[PDB]
RNA sequence: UACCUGGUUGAUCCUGCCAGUAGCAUAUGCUUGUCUCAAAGAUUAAGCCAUGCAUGUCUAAGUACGCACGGCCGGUACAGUGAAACUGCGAAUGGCUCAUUAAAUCAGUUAUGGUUCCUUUGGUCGCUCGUACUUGGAUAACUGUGGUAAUUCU
RNA sequence: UGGUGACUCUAGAUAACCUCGGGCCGAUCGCACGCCGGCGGCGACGACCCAUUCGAACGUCUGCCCUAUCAACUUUCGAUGGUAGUCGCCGUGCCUACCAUGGUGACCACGGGUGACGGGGAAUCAGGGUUCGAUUCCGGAGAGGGAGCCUGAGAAACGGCUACCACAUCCAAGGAAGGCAGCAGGCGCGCAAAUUACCCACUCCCGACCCGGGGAGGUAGUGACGAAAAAUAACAAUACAGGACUCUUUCGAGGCCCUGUAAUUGGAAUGAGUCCACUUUAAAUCCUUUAACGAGGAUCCAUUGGAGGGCAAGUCUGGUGCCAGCAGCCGCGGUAAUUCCAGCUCCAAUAGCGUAUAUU
């Protein structure tokens, strides 16, 4: 290479996009944005592959360039704009609202939310720094920087912000016994309560999480998103409630659903 | 005395029996560099054009097993044929190379 | 005499049925004889057999399926 | 770089010893009472049986409470019971190890057309299959090696677009009727 | 008569102002139905004028009892002319393209980049 | 399918190899009816190349006195479409090949608390105590005169 | 003030500095026009700095084939380290100046070789292994060989520039121009590898951009590399031949069945092809769907290797007579050839089957 890369091969694309092999040689290649390339869903895939509102990319371009899609309250006309975790998608013509939160299998789920629930979002805070004239600044997981946050807010907490103004409405601390979602690694998509944090100086901390069914799983500290105060989430959960069923229980659920209806 | 022989071919059949007699005499006497060209591929419909090109290669392949046929329909195909004739490795006939002619 | 490196070898043509199809200074395609670099079971010093003469096979000339150009 | 895939398998294996009298008699017998075209179909069915046996004996070495042994054993047993090569009461891995190639050759569409009385012989059944005279409940099937499930057994009907079936006469009868 | 039409996966796409669906055509002993008759039957089904229905991608199953394709019914002809591919509009006769190969355009473009000025327009 | 068979002696038992046997890849010979996929100038010469094509780009939103066209209404600076050209961006992606390269590349694992960054996204953008109801000079495109056998020369 | 596991971190205060080859503090453009000359709401384009994204670049640990007929190697001309600086985007012998004599090695240094780009991976596979990976994904390198640059955020760029070396083009002889290890195509080399085709409709990329471009890519063409499915007949009557069953001690008798074999008849069924239409598609082709024609020597004719053993299948007949030849090996052929050349018959695989070579 002599500079930055502009193409993404279809088999090099993230597996949670669920792109097939024989449609083309290339994958949509998310443009630069608030979310990482391996941890985002472009607008073209969400509108075309997921919602089936379009069949080709030019149709997605028509939908985008009619200024119908809103991401986090702002109109996006980029077909490959990286939409990521907790992002709110508003389609005012069809009157739909979505929050990109993970399915239990580790994939972005089509999750419909109430319009009044689309007025806020949660952000895990990445860093805090005092900038010039002694002004505290807050940087979250989607590149949002806020001047003058609450002094009790520290790193690895979660802020609930209003999307119209971008100001902190509330916050949740990283304490033992709080609700969290795993946003990376093997346990991706699982919702539980924090029971531990194993501090390794010079290395990664370890958060042990206990599920609602009694199942325990550890993750890195960077893979934890605090979503609730103790036991109740501050967002709406998908069809699955974060519990990962084993393949035997999923088989039993499939057979029971086939038996009851069919 | 020639340096290259251009064999003209029928699109439908390979050659007549007269052409087979001429080919037997030319093979026995000695072949210089040769090129095969088909004359009548344009008159047919296109589906029949492709199928008859396949059938013609099948028919000719029992005497010229690895030789590419050309086409003689337009002036640009003639130009490609002339360029092919110019740049081509020369089969050398051992008899006429020693005596003057 | 091989074209690609100038080395001279001795190749086996099967019979007087086939030997009369080879004249002097013809271009012959030659294979190994079968024992991976070892000699024929009766005649010594030969490890190769003639496969094609004048860019046409010996089997199609022995069986009369083709004729060779001169 | 293309939008093409290159996944492909060989579906049989040629035998190690080519000329065995007992083996030649066995495969020729199987071709005989099953109306098969050549030896490659025997080798194909033997290959699928060998794959199933290899999977079963790999699963059998695990501990009997292993989750993967339970899941893959139940899946293999259900797949064998679905096509009628295992009985509904013989769902265990030892019974998988006890299977034979005749059980899989019995489940072909050609054999089932012969058995259900749609044809007078096994070769007539193959010719009848290949000539689009047979359907499986909606769908004309050309393939004699179509393995019939248990829910397709009572549905091998007889191609309502054929002279033998629905009733439009064929080419030869239509031409012969025009002679008079 | 004996040829029937059903629509399977209906969807009201308000973002491109249309209705999109999967079309199952049953013709037990006929050929594959021409898209014109499918369009008239869809117009009769959905109570619309037949020039706003665009159908494509019909594949007839082995044996020949069923054909499956895709279709969309637009709100008007203007939304059709806005949101349809050019080739489907040309299939319906509403669009026409220039008759020029890629070789002519490419060789012309490479020819007029040897020339600077208004004389670029003088290359034919 | 955790497999062997023939060959030394007059005969036997053996060490031992050769030969057989089955797959896989390249070439080749003979033959070839249907249909679904599908590799393909790598090996030898990272040898040499005729010709053609493969990188260009405009929105309401940088610069429109090309009638190149064009409705006005007739002093309305510029209606509008728009070649050219200036300006901005891209051309560092892609594609090809495997010559070099032997702790080198590369794979996993870590660090930048030792660095750089077009773009996107967010913040910041009266925080400076010191002609503006708008500043200056050109240069293309255009017009005209030319030089060279020749050029995407000027 | 705030942070880290740890700052010479971030933030604060003071004294100054602040480069003309100069650092921010908007002399920019569009759309609706409206409230009390003034106030204005949407955007676009810039914009020092901070964070973010895409990365890039230098480091950490461990991991590579063959060779001792390579046993000692490095050190002026940096080899290992120290001090100060230069240069660099930055850490650093990166370089310079001054000092120390260090650094590596039978745990294989150093040197040479490779028919060596590395990896994901592929073939084979009881278990263990052995061989391969030029090749569509990731990373590296290169654009005939070296070297030096310009612009730019990013290149030591070659579908950019400047030289030299080797080639090679045009010429009015003064001069000018070049780089297919891009897509086709050609020559050469060879045992060895496709069309100078159509299109941006799909996948995506770029741009001022919903509109343009793309030999990236898609689609056809050649294509027995390889993989999958699968025709070349089936049935009925008649005639012989067997096997069962009934009555017979048996021979025998069975419109008693079943199954074969046809120099015997018969119409039934279908594809292969020929060719309307629809469908397919950017427009086509092919496939699929359907009209019409389309089979008895159903001449609408299946080949490739073999028949002594290994190894399945002839001591048949004619010809040759240690010749011609066959034969992987043992061997056959010298006048009764189970093996050569043929006819007939038989065997194995089958739209495939031999041969050479690499490798398991």
UniProtKB/Swiss-Prot annotation, chain A:
CDD domains named in the record: KOW_RPS4, S4
Pfam families registered for this protein in UniProt: 40S_S4_C, KOW, Ribosomal_S4e, RS4NT
Subcellular localization(s) per the UniProt record: Cytoplasm; Nucleus, Nucleolus
N6-acetyllysine: residues carrying this PTM: 232
GO molecular function, one term: RNA binding
SMART domains: S4
PROSITE patterns named in the record: RIBOSOMAL_S4E, S4
InterPro entries: KOW, Rib_uL2_dom2, Ribosomal_eS4, Ribosomal_eS4_C, Ribosomal_eS4_central_region, Ribosomal_eS4_central_sf, Ribosomal_eS4_KOW, Ribosomal_eS4_N
Similarity field: Belongs to the eukaryotic ribosomal protein eS4 family.
Function of the protein: Component of the small ribosomal subunit. The ribosome is a large ribonucleoprotein complex responsible for the synthesis of proteins in the cell. Part of the small subunit (SSU) processome, first precursor of the small eukaryotic ribosomal subunit. During the assembly of the SSU processome in the nucleolus, many ribosome biogenesis factors, an RNA chaperone and ribosomal proteins associate with the nascent pre-rRNA and work in concert to generate RNA folding, modifications, rearrangements and cleavage as well as targeted degradation of pre-ribosomal RNA by the RNA exosome.
Name this polypeptide is given: Small ribosomal subunit protein eS4, X isoform
Curated annotation (Swiss-Prot), chain B:
Organism: Homo sapiens (Human)
Function: Required during maturation of the 40S ribosomal subunit in the nucleolus.
Subcellular location, record wording: Nucleus, Nucleolus
Name the UniProt record assigns to this protein: Pre-rRNA-processing protein TSR1 homolog
Coiled coil stretches, renumbered: none
Family, as annotated: Belongs to the TRAFAC class translation factor GTPase superfamily. Bms1-like GTPase family. TSR1 subfamily.
UniProt superkingdom: Eukaryota
Curated annotation (Swiss-Prot), chain C:
UniProt subcellular location: Cytoplasm, Cytosol; Cytoplasm; Rough endoplasmic reticulum; Nucleus, Nucleolus
Domain of life the protein comes from: Eukaryota
Modified residue annotations for N6-acetyllysine: 63
Clinical note on disease: Brachycephaly, trichomegaly, and developmental delay: An autosomal dominant developmental disorder characterized by brachycephaly, ciliary trichomegaly, dysmorphic features of the face and hands, hearing loss, and developmental delay with short stature. Intellectual disability and autism spectrum disorder may be present in some patients.
Quaternary structure and interacting proteins, as annotated: Component of the 40S small ribosomal subunit. Part of the small subunit (SSU) processome, composed of more than 70 proteins and the RNA chaperone small nucleolar RNA (snoRNA) U3.
Protein role: Component of the ribosome, a large ribonucleoprotein complex responsible for the synthesis of proteins in the cell. The small ribosomal subunit (SSU) binds messenger RNAs (mRNAs) and translates the encoded message by selecting cognate aminoacyl-transfer RNA (tRNA) molecules. The large subunit (LSU) contains the ribosomal catalytic site termed the peptidyl transferase center (PTC), which catalyzes the formation of peptide bonds, thereby polymerizing the amino acids delivered by tRNAs into a polypeptide chain.
Family the entry assigns: Belongs to the universal ribosomal protein uS12 family.
Name the record gives this protein: Small ribosomal subunit protein uS12
Native source species: Homo sapiens
Residues of the full protein shown: 73 to 142 of 143
Curated annotation (Swiss-Prot), chain D:
Region (Disordered): 161-180
Record's keyword annotation contains Acetylation: yes
Annotated InterPro entries: Ribosomal_uS4, Ribosomal_uS4_CS, Ribosomal_uS4_euk/arc, Ribosomal_uS4_N, S4_RNA-bd, S4_RNA-bd_sf
Major site of localization recorded for this protein: cytoplasm
Compartments (UniProt record): Cytoplasm; Nucleus, Nucleolus
Residue ranges annotated for the S4 RNA-binding domain, each copy included: 107-180
Residues where N6-acetyllysine is found: 65, 115, 154
Gene3D superfamilies: RNA-binding S4 domain
GO CC annotation, single: cytosolic ribosome
One BP term from GO: translation
Record carries keyword RNA-binding: yes
Gene Ontology MF terms: RNA binding; rRNA binding; structural constituent of ribosome; translation regulator activity
UniProt keyword list: Acetylation, Cytoplasm, Isopeptide bond, Nucleus, Phosphoprotein, Ribonucleoprotein, Ribosomal protein, RNA-binding, rRNA-binding, Ubl conjugation
Outcome of substituting residue 136 to F: In a breast cancer sample; somatic mutation
Linked residues for Glycyl lysine isopeptide (Lys-Gly) (interchain with G-Cter in SUMO2): 92, 138
Phosphoserine PTM positions: 152, 162
Family that this chain belongs to: Belongs to the universal ribosomal protein uS4 family.
NCBIfam families reported in the protein's UniProt record: PRK04051.1, uS4_arch
Purpose: Component of the small ribosomal subunit. The ribosome is a large ribonucleoprotein complex responsible for the synthesis of proteins in the cell. Part of the small subunit (SSU) processome, first precursor of the small eukaryotic ribosomal subunit. During the assembly of the SSU processome in the nucleolus, many ribosome biogenesis factors, an RNA chaperone and ribosomal proteins associate with the nascent pre-rRNA and work in concert to generate RNA folding, modifications, rearrangements and cleavage as well as targeted degradation of pre-ribosomal RNA by the RNA exosome.
Name recorded for this polypeptide: Small ribosomal subunit protein uS4
Organism: Homo sapiens (Human)
């Amino acid at each position: 290479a002599r500079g930055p890369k502009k193409h993404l091969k279809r088999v090099a694309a993230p597996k949670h996009w669920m792109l097939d092999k024989l449609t083309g040689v290339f994958a949509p290649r998310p443009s630069t944005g608030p979310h990482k390339l391996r941890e985002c869903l472009p607008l073209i895939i969400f509108l075309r592959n997921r919602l089936k509102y379009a069949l080709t990319g030019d149709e997605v371009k028509k939908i985008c360039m009619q200024r119908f899609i809103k991401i986090d309250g702002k109109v996006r006309t980029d077909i490959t704009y990286p939409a990521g975790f907790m992002d709110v998608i508003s389609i005012d013509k069809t009157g739909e609202n979505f929050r990109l939160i993970y399915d239990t299998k580790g994939r972005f789920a089509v999750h419909r939310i109430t319009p009044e629930e689309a007025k806020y979002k949660l952000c895990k805070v990445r860093k805090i720094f005092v900038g010039t004239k002694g002004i505290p600044h807050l940087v979250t997981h989607d590149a949002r920087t806020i001047r003058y946050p609450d002094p009790l807010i520290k790193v690895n907490d979660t802020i609930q912000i209003d999307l119209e103004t971008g100001k902190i409405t509330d916050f949740i601390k990283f304490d033992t016994g709080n609700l969290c979602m795993v946003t990376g690694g093997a346990n991706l998509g699982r919702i539980g309560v924090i029971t531990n944090r194993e501090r390794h100086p010079g290395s990664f901390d370890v958060v042990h999480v206990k599920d609602a069914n009694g199942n325990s799983f550890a993750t890195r500290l960077s893979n934890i998103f605090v979503i609730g105060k103790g036991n109740k989430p501050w967002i709406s959960l998908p069809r699955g409630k974060g519990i990962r069923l084993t393949i035997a229980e999923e088989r039993d659920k499939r057979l029971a659903a086939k038996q009851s209806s069919g | 005395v020639a340096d290259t022989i251009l064999f003209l071919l029928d699109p439908l059949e390979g050659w007549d029996s007269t052409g087979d007699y001429c080919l037997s005499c030319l093979f026995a006497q000695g072949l210089p560099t040769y090129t095969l060209a088909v004359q009548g591929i344009s008159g047919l419909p296109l589906k029949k054009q492709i199928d008859t090109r396949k059938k013609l290669s099948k028919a000719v392949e029992k005497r010229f097993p690895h030789d590419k046929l050309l086409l003689l329909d337009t002036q640009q195909e003639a130009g490609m044929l002339l360029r092919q004739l110019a740049n081509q490795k020369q089969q050398h006939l051992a008899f006429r190379d020693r005596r003057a002619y | 005499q091989l074209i690609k490196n100038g080395k001279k070898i001795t190749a086996f043509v099967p019979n007087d049925g086939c030997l009369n199809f080879i004249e002097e200074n013809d271009e012959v395609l030659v294979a190994g004889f079968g024992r991976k670099g070892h000699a024929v079971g009766d005649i010594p010093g030969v490890r190769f057999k003639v496969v094609k003469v004048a860019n046409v096979s010996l089997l199609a000339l022995y069986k009369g399926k083709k004729e060779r150009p001169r | 770089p293309v939008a093409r895939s290159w996944v492909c398998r060989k579906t049989y294996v040629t035998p190690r010893r080519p000329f065995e009298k007992s083996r030649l008699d066995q495969e020729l017998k199987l071709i005989g009472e099953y109306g098969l075209r050549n030896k490659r179909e025997v080798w194909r069915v033997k290959f699928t049986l060998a794959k199933i046996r290899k999977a079963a004996r790999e699963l059998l070495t695990l501990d009997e409470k292993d989750p993967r042994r339970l899941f893959e054993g139940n899946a293999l047993l259900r797949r064998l019971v679905r096509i009628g090569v295992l009985d509904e009461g013989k769902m265990k891995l030892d019974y998988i190890l006890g299977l034979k190639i005749e059980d899989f050759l019995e489940r072909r569409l050609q054999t089932q057309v012969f058995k259900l009385g749609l044809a007078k012989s096994i070769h007539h059944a193959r010719v009848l299959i290949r000539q689009r005279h047979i359907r499986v409940r909606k769908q004309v099937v050309n393939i004699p090696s179509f393995i019939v499930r248990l829910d397709s057994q009572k549905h091998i009907d007889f191609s309502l677009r054929s002279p033998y079936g629905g009733g439009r006469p064929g080419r030869v009868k239509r031409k012969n009727a025009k002679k008079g | 008569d004996t040829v029937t039409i059903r629509t399977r996966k209906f969807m009201t796409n308000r973002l491109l102002q249309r209705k999109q669906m999967v079309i199952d055509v049953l013709h037990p002993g006929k050929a594959t139905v021409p898209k014109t008759e499918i369009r008239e039957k869809l117009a009769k089904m959905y109570k619309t004028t037949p020039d706003v229905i665009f159908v494509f991608g019909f594949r007839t199953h082995f044996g020949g009892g069923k054909t499956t394709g895709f279709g969309m019914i637009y709100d008007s002809l203007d939304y059709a002319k806005k949101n349809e591919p050019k080739h489907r509009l040309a299939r319906h006769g509403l669009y026409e393209k220039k008759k020029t190969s890629r070789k002519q355009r490419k060789e012309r473009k490479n020819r007029m980049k040897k020339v600077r000025g208004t004389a670029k327009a003088n290359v034919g």
